[PDB]
């Protein structure tokens, strides 16, 4: 979606990135760590509960 749209947007505009998860306890410590790794690498926000 971003690859498509950034062409059709102001060249200095970077849309926000935010995701969700319910019952986040299905994650464990390593799960959390790696997800945060990749999330930061992609400059994205989490709402994981």
């Amino acid at each position: 979606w971003e690859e498509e749209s950034r062409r059709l947007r102001g060249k200095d505009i970077s849309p926000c990135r935010l995701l969700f998860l319910d019952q986040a306890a299905r994650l464990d410590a390593k799960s959390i760590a790696t997800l945060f790794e990749l999330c930061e690498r992609l400059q994205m926000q989490l709402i994981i509960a």
Binding site: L19, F20, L21, D22, R26
Partner: protein, 49 residues
């Protein structure tokens, strides 16, 4: 769909099948082609009857 799939993500969910929905565009060309076939068949049926 992005929203709800993230909310209920993971492999063991409808997400893994409704991929073909969430990832892919709906093609009007095939829709139109099918309608044209339908018209052809309708005319054939009318003639045969």
């Amino acid at each position: 769909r992005l929203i709800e799939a993230s909310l209920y993500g993971g492999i063991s969910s409808a997400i893994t099948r409704s991929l073909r929905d969430y990832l892919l565009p709906e093609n009007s060309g095939v829709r139109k082609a099918f309608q044209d076939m339908e018209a052809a068949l309708r005319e054939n049926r009318i003639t045969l009857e």
